Design a protein around this ligand. Structure first.
Ligand SMILES: Cc1cc2nc3c(=O)[nH]c(=O)nc-3n(C[C@H](O)[C@H](O)[C@H](O)COP(=O)(O)OP(=O)(O)OC[C@H]3O[C@@H](n4cnc5c(N)ncnc54)[C@H](O)[C@@H]3O)c2cc1C
Ligand SMILES: Cc1nc2c(=O)[nH]c(=O)nc-2n(C[C@H](O)[C@H](O)[C@H](O)CO)c1C
Ligand code: SF4
Length: 508
């Protein structure tokens, strides 16, 4: 009875973490490591580093206040080996333990590494039951399904959680209340001001250290306003539930120039490191509808993103890795344009997405999908390069969620496992859902010439290039019919325009 060494990683900052269950506070030790391996696996946004390390230090203090013995290895510690495995070994050398207990993590490569570590004591790995669907449950649901579709997974998660269920039937008599025909904000409507969290003293200290120590990483650290502990994160959630959730269903796919948050919740960076709980979030939204403070379409749309999409992508990741990370179904080989890093492009929609990534480490979903994701797919950027960008620039990015949304939904590099069709779109889509195109120097009605919106020739070149395959996919009938009715000279024209754009943008 020497006790257990309990590992807590930077995205595991929850009192209810399975590795902390049944802790013997008089014998056990919690290990937390500020890891340069993890901090450089991708060159994470400076604000992601601030968030994780500020949240970790505060979580350690919360554990100590509850009686835990915490071995906390900081970035400045000259004996820190830099890695989780190295620090495990060193912790085990410092005092006697009977075993290591940890919670399976959110990156296949680290999980595979930790599972094969040869340590002097046994290492027990527990599932991360903060998620609503276990890895085993997803595998069992997916078995024998020719295609994995969120629509059907979501119904299963509604029945299992009981969220928005009146007995055995969905509230309102339908599962999903998504509406077609949603469009951009009306000219006069101004998105409301959003609550941000001024840095607390711990966060300020970490801000100063990241500013000095990681200046080469992407992004601005000034203005950091993300919540870094459960009190701050609940404040963000409270604001969303009371002030934004009633409007959540009107504007989920709209874009407004330099209004980067609209009515979104801004909870993903906190949720993905454990500062909020998925079930609790959804129950709070359900209560808003039950009690007459929000309409059902809004609340259902919100809950579907958390118990549906979030759990579905996690399921696909662990079911399909490691091969998933290698898939390149459209044989994309291009380089990522420099403007993905600098924002220096005349494409107003792209420039605004990069602006928000740089300044806030955030862009909302339809920008990630239909602006920068769609563009990378149409350009034929190699999926490794695309995954790298999405991992670096957003404060909510962890591989389990980034990769199926990026390699899958946004770029079809997975051949449709997540998304069932490429989300390709011309500039017409961005024009219908945003206020970007009028102020953009490009003409969204033109396909050819130096004034043409690049998305237009790129879209048709993409449909053309992959025409044989997309006609088999099944769900692209309208674009292929339009392509077919085009005379040959018109097709050759947009092929040449797209070739030019790929040279101009530094792709290929
Ligand atoms: C190419 C691309 C890459 C993405 N990379 C990430 C990533 O690294 N991390 C991440 O957490 N999300 C990722 N997303 C999903 C989604 O864009 C973000 O979760 C969302 O923008 C976060 O903003 P929010 O907290 O304001 O969410 P809201 O719009 O308020 O939505 C509520 C919550 O639903 C969840 N959610 C919504 N859509 C998804 C989805 N598609 N997948 C998973 N959870 C979702 C999040 O928990 C989010 O907080 C990606 C989407 C795309 C298309
Ligand atoms: C920047 C960063 N730093 C750390 C760290 O210092 N220590 C740690 O234990 N985890 C860190 N993380 C999170 C991991 O890199 C990784 O994304 C998660 O552990 C996946 O579950 C991140 C993202
Ligand atoms: S015209 Fe094209 S490039 Fe410019 S904002 Fe519209 S969609 Fe984006």
């Amino acid at each position: 009875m020497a006790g257990a060494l309990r590992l807590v990683l930077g995205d595991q900052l929850s009192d209810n973490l399975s590795a902390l269950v049944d802790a013997d506070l008089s014998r056990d030790q919690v290990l937390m490591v500020e890891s340069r391996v993890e901090a450089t696996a991708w060159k994470h946004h400076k604000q992601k580093l601030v968030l994780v390390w500020s949240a970790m230090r505060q979580f350690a203090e919360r554990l100590r206040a509850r009686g835990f013995n915490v071995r906390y290895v900081t970035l400045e510690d000259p004996d820190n080996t830099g890695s989780i495995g190295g620090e495990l070994r060193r912790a085990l050398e410092a005092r006697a333990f009977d075993r290591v207990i940890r919670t399976a993590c959110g990156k296949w490569g680290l999980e595979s590494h930790l599972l094969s570590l040869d340590l002097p004591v046994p290492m027990e790995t527990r599932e991360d039951d903060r998620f609503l669907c276990s890895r085993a449950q997803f595998a069992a649901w997916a078995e024998g399904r020719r295609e994995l579709r969120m629509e059907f997974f979501y119904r299963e998660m509604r029945r299992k959680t009981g969220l928005l269920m009146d007995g055995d039937q969905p509230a309102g008599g339908r599962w999903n209340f998504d509406a077609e025909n949603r469009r951009k904000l009306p000219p006069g409507l101004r998105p409301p001001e959003r609550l941000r969290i001024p840095p607390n003293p711990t966060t300020q200290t970490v801000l100063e250290q990241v500013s000095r120590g990681f200046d080469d990483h992407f992004g601005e650290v000034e203005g950091f306003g993300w919540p870094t502990n459960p009190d701050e994160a609940t404040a963000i959630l409270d604001h969303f539930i009371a002030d934004m959730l009633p409007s959540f269903g009107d504007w989920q796919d709209a874009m407004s120039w330099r209004r980067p948050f609209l009515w979104h919740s801004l909870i993903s960076p906190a949720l993905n490191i454990g500062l909020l709980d998925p079930l609790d979030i959804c129950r709070r939204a359900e209560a808003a509808w039950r009690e007459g403070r929000a309409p059902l379409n809004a609340v259902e749309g919100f809950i579907r993103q958390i118990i549906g999409w979030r759990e579905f992508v996690r399921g696909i990741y662990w079911l399909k890795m490691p091969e998933y990370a290698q898939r390149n179904a459209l044989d994309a080989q291009g380089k990522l344009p420099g403007f993905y890093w600098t924002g220096q492009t005349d494409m107003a929609c792209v420039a605004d997405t990069v602006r928000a990534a740089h300044d806030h480490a955030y862009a909302h979903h339809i920008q990630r999908l239909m602006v920068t994701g769609n563009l990378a797919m149409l350009l034929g950027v190699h999926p490794d390069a695309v995954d790298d960008w999405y991992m670096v620039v957003f404060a909510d990015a962890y591989e389990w969620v980034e990769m199926p949304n990026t390699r899958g939904m946004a770029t079809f590099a997975d051949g449709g496992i997540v998304g069932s069709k490429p989300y390709a779109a011309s500039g017409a889509y961005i024009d219908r859902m945003s206020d970007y195109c009028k102020g953009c120097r490009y003409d969204v009605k033109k396909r050819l010439g130096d004034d043409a919106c690049p998305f237009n020739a790129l879209y048709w070149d993409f449909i053309d290039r992959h025409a044989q395959r997309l006609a088999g996919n099944g769900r692209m009938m309208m674009p292929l019919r339009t392509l077919e009715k085009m005379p040959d000279a018109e097709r050759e024209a947009f092929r040449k325009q797209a070739r030019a754009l790929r040279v101009k943008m530094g792709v290929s």
